[PDB]
Amino acid sequence: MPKPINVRVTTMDAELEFAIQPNTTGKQLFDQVVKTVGLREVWFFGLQYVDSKGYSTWLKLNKKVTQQDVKKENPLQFKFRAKFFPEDVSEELIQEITQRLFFLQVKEAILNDEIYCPPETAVLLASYAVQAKYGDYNKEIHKPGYLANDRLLPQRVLEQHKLTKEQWEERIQNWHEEHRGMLREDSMMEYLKIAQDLEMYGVNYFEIKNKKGTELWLGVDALGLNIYEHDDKLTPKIGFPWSEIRNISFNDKKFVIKPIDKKAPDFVFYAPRLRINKRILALCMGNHELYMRRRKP
Ligand SMILES: O=P(O)(O)O[C@@H]1[C@H](O)[C@H](O)[C@@H](OP(=O)(O)O)[C@H](OP(=O)(O)O)[C@H]1O
């Protein structure tokens, strides 16, 4: 009689562990996590893991987690993260819990430079993050240098020799002071409001190439498909909202965008490995279904 498998699921700010059955499905496991967290806006999330070959991967709901080549470790390692992003944080993130998990994930991303962010904006962001952690600024508790141990800015901004840490840190203090009567909840939501407008926010980039053989970037967001030149991942060269796409399919390393736009050329591009296009497709499918449920429903 088969022994249970140990699994470790980690949210941005929590450690969860379960004892799964040899025949448990990704869906049943997802069900457990969500029920345990009390998350309701489930359509945004999913479970992430690394496969035996080393790649990061999204867990398939409709299968036995045991049949998904997830790198064998004692407690199996899983990461609960947001897979899809809303079009407007304010209208779609209702639960206080969902709001927090998005703030925590987006912040990390900013902090790692995964999402470009102008220095002055970065400081402005950092200030809300502290109002959320340290509450209101009290001159007696929050003595100067109360942040010198915090990770607040990306390493990219600190490289601004125009100022120094303590300088940058007091810049943030100014903005912290200005946020006095602000709730924790509200501050995290302002952070999200400011970050959702950043060009690189919510877009999944993929290294691609066209007929010509030229390097190109492919972005999949909640709103459609964007093709970026190489030196610029902020501003698209050609776009394709979900309401402008008639059909998208891939051949081996062949991707065809069929535009609803009756008298417009099909856009075609080639992606490196096959398992890549496989995932690019899954995202398109997802952001598309989420795009519809926002209108037609
Ligand atoms: O029939 P199953 O048990 O789902 O078997 C396949 C498995 O779930 C893959 O992970 C999935 O790729 P995605 O990650 O792109 O879903 C593939 O989809 P496909 O058949 O549409 O390639 C499925 O066929």
Swiss-Prot record:
It is found in: Cell membrane; Cytoplasm, Cytoskeleton; Cleavage furrow; Cell projection, Microvillus. Residues 5-295 form the FERM domain. The modification N6-succinyllysine is found at residue 83. It comes from the Eukaryota. One of its GO terms (cellular component) is myelin sheath. Phosphorylated by tyrosine-protein kinases. Phosphorylation by ROCK2 suppresses the head-to-tail association of the N-terminal and C-terminal halves resulting in an opened conformation which is capable of actin and membrane-binding. One of its GO terms (molecular function) is actin binding. A 1,2-diacyl-sn-glycero-3-phospho-(1D-myo-inositol) binds at residues 60-63, 278. It is a peripheral membrane protein. Keywords: Actin capping, Actin-binding, Cell membrane, Cell projection, Cytoplasm, Cytoskeleton, Membrane, Phosphoprotein. Interacts with CPNE1 (via VWFA domain) and CPNE4 (via VWFA domain). Binds NHERF1. Interacts with LAYN. Interacts with NHERF1 and NHERF2. Interacts with MME/NEP. Interacts with ICAM2. Interacts (via FERM domain) with SPN/CD43 cytoplasmic tail. Interacts with CD44. Interacts with CLIC5; may work together in a complex which also includes EZR and MYO6 to stabilize linkages between the plasma membrane and subjacent actin cytoskeleton at the base of stereocilia. The N-terminal domain interacts with the C-terminal domain of LAYN. An interdomain interaction between its N-terminal and C-terminal domains inhibits its ability to bind LAYN. In the presence of acidic phospholipids, the interdomain interaction is inhibited and this enhances binding to LAYN. This is Radixin. It comes from Mus musculus (Mouse). The gene is Rdx. The chain holds residues 1 to 297 of 583 of the full protein.
